[PDB]
């Protein structure tokens, strides 16, 4: 296994054969190593591109992609250095506590249909409220919040309700 030995050991005519064995083998090993590196490097570069994208989308802005920035509605990320790599401290919004409510896609004031501009219809049981999707806040269902579309006949799930009009109190008062 030692080149210096072979050189000291054999004359060139004979030595050439033995050294040749090592060269073909060793080179082949080196060849093996390089191929591994290229493949491995590709994997890392694949990660780098992803890393760049994460840095690009997650750090530089708030990414929309679900489970891109960590489990949950992503807030933001703080990139951190590391040896031969990077670490991100994603800040993600995860819903903690929940409560059941009864829903219906719409409500009829007049016999007409109302859908929520933003939110979904719910009820405390006594009264109906419309609220945002991921954190509960009920609101008095007024025309200001709701928009018109169709009538009660087609709706599936629509429930009779009363919508408050802020205008009436102004004129009557």
């Amino acid at each position: 296994s030692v080149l210096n030995d072979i050189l000291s050991r054999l004359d060139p005519p004979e030595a050439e054969v033995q050294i040749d064995r090592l060269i073909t083998g060793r080179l082949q090993s080196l060849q093996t190593y390089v191929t591994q590196q290229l493949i491995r490097a590709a994997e890392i570069r694949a990660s780098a591109n992803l890393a760049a994208t994460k840095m690009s989308e997650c750090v530089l802005g708030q990414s929309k992609r679900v489970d891109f920035c960590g489990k949950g509605y992503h807030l933001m990320s703080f990139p951190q250095s590391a040896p031969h790599g990077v670490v991100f401290l994603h800040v993600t919004y995860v819903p903690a506590q929940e409560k059941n409510f009864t829903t219906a896609p719409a409500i009829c004031h007049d016999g007409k249909a109302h859908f929520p501009r933003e939110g979904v219809f719910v009820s405390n049981g006594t009264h109906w409220f419309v609220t945002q999707r991921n954190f509960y806040e009920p609101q008095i269902i007024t025309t200001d919040n709701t928009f018109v579309s169709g009538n009660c006949d087609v709706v599936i799930g629509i429930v009779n309700n009363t919508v408050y009009d802020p205008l009436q109190p102004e004129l009557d008062s």
């Binding site: 920035c69 994603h90 919004y93 829903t103």
Partner: protein
């Protein structure tokens, strides 16, 4: 691992292999034997000058009888080992049987000279074959003298190997024309041997048979006998059928081979089911059980008790693989016991099967996971060392859940959490 400490996980330490129980050597059925009996136990013998040459071919020539038999005074084979004949095969075999004097018997060998070697029966220097001879004082000798055997005194030139000259014509030594008759300088070319039972050992007629074995590229017709063994099935054995060899468990197959066809073949080009040369049975090809061995251990810091997974094997082979019956009772416990769990992946020993499902600590395969767990009951105590053990179970997919789905209800969260998690990715390799 080349380390004193081992992190928890599954590691492939070595390879499991069933060793072969016995060796089987086989050659085809014995029938169609060459007629040796005609040569050796022949009623009559030819003379040295014109010897009988019977070619032996298209048979399984069983030499063993000639080698083993006492009846022959000598049995010498130049080219090949006399023991080897049963194994060796020759393209063509010629048997030259002739009766010659005892003293002259030595002459029948390669590179020899003499009355027989030069004029009578010459052998090639390279000659490959065996010479077998025995005395026939009882048979050949006559009180009156047995003249019947002749050898040759004169010839135009020396005789080539295996050249025989039967010719009766009068040899003309001198100038005078013989005209077919003896006279001055004219002699019958052959002289007879006077064998008589009274004579000495050298004097006694001997029957010698030389089996030349011409070896050519051409198909070999005369091969040796078949030393075969019994066939054992359903066991990892080292089998040697006519042409090929290998290890596996021979079983009865349900394959219909054509009368002419000997061996099957894999799509892949493998040896799958073979026809036994002795019995027309079709036996299908199975590599003997083997598989990987993986050690499932908890970290060394935690414990040193382990569990082993014998991949892709049935629990049955492990006690047979080693000779459990042979072993000491300390060793015997390890082979079998209640504490064995069999899974699709293989036979896992050292781990108790558990009904309860938990998260997967170490993956076994086929959905089975192993972990080191102990139930602990102690005040203000973490699970301390106790009768702890390694358990294997169907890995829990997780606490199963269900959602109260309805036409009319929603679940809207009242409060949330701001969490932080870490996602780690490699950026660069070391610039080697």
């Amino acid at each position: 691992l080349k380390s004193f400490t081992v992190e928890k996980g599954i590691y492939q330490t070595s390879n499991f292999r069933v060793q072969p129980t016995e060796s089987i050597v086989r050659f085809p059925n014995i029938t169609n034997l060459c007629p040796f009996g005609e040569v050796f136990n022949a009623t009559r013998f030819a003379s040295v000058y014109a010897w009988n040459r019977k070619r032996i071919s298209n048979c399984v020539a069983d030499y063993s009888v000639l080698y083993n038999s006492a009846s022959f005074s000598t049995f010498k084979c130049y080219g090949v080992s006399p023991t080897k004949l049963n194994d060796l095969c020759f393209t063509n075999v010629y048997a030259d049987s002739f009766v010659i004097r005892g003293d002259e018997v030595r002459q029948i060998a390669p590179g020899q000279t003499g009355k027989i070697a030069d004029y009578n029966y010459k052998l090639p220097d390279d000659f490959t074959g065996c010479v077998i001879a025995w005395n026939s004082n009882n048979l050949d000798s006559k009180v009156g003298g047995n003249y019947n055997y002749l050898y040759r005194l004169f010839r135009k030139s020396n005789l080539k190997p295996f050249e025989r000259d039967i010719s009766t014509e009068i040899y003309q030594a001198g100038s005078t024309p013989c005209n077919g008759v003896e006279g001055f300088n004219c002699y019958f070319p052959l002289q007879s041997y006077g064998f008589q039972p009274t004579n000495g050992v050298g004097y006694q007629p001997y029957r010698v048979v030389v089996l030349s074995f011409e070896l050519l590229h051409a198909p070999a017709t005369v091969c040796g006998p078949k030393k075969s063994t019994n066939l054992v099935k359903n066991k990892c054995v080292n089998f040697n059928f006519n042409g090929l060899t290998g290890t596996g468990v021979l079983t009865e197959s349900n394959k219909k081979f054509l009368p002419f066809q000997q061996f099957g073949r894999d799509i892949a080009d493998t040896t799958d089911a073979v026809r036994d040369p002795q019995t027309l049975e079709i036996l299908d090809i199975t590599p003997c059980s083997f598989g990987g061995v993986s050690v499932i251990t908890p970290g060394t810091n935690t414990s040193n008790q382990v569990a082993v997974l014998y991949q892709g094997v049935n629990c049955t082979e492990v006690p047979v693989a080693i000779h459990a019956d042979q072993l000491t009772p300390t060793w015997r416990v390890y082979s079998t016991g209640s504490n064995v769990f069999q899974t699709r992946a293989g036979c896992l020993i050292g781990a108790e099967h558990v009904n309860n499902s938990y998260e997967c600590d170490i993956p076994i395969g086929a959905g089975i996971c192993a972990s080191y767990q102990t139930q602990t009951n102690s005040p203000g105590s973490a699970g301390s060392v106790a009768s702890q053990s390694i358990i294997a179970y169907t890995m829990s997919l997780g606490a199963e859940n269900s959602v109260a789905y309805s036409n009319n209800s929603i679940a809207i969260p009242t409060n949330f959490t701001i969490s932080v998690t870490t996602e780690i990715l490699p950026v660069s390799m070391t610039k080697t």
